[PDB]
Design a protein around this ligand. Structure first.
Ligand SMILES: [Zn+2]
Length: 197
């Protein structure tokens, strides 16, 4: 690893290698750098979103294409690349759901796309019950009950998946996170139904 302007060696040291100490040029982003690192926090399901938002700004102060409009094409390139990554990381870590799923990827676990079959019975039952309820839900208050029901589950699940990580129990975390995916959809459908008011 070396600088595109100098040839200055990338030090085998600490992480934030945004600028070349030798020539001040904006460097190519490290593909290997995970989002928790880029957002300067521990690999953890638990994430301080006030801090996160602050980091997001610090970095966007450094790499956003606005500051590179008058600079070389190479720097414009990298400025755009970085700024995109910064956005990804931020969005990914901000949402507990995407955070959970991202946390699993690093721990080397890939997720099947909401595979409806690999699921257990009791949960399936819950899902078709919620469905029925929502389908039946036309009144504004019957609408509230579902929201409650859904949000009460969401909390329970967050607590659970938090534990799963605390214990390194990724097979469990993958389970619960696959569940949380369902309820997110249901949430979005409710919000979509809630538009006309
Ligand atoms: Zn350099």
């Amino acid at each position: 690893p070396r600088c595109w302007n100098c040839g200055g060696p990338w030090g085998p040291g600490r992480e934030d290698r945004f600028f070349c100490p030798q020539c001040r040029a904006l460097q190519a982003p490290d593909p290997t750098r995970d989002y928790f690192s880029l957002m300067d926090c521990n690999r953890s399901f638990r994430v301080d979103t006030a801090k996160l938002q602050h980091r997001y700004q610090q970095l966007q102060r450094l790499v956003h294409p606005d500051f590179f409009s008058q600079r070389s094409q190479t720097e414009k390139d990298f400025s755009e690349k970085h700024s995109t990554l910064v956005n990804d990381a931020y969005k990914t870590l901000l949402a507990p759901l995407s955070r959970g799923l991202y946390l699993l990827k690093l721990h080397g676990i890939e997720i099947p796309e909401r595979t409806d079959y690999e699921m257990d019975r009791q949960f399936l039952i819950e899902i078709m019950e919620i469905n029925e309820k929502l389908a039946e839900a036309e009144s504004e208050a019957a609408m509230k009950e579902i929201e409650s029901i859904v949000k009460a589950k969401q909390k329970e699940f967050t607590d659970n998946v938090s534990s799963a990580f605390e214990q390194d129990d990724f097979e469990e975390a993958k389970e619960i996170l696959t569940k949380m995916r369902y309820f997110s959809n249901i949430e979005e459908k409710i919000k979509l139904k809630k538009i006309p008011l």
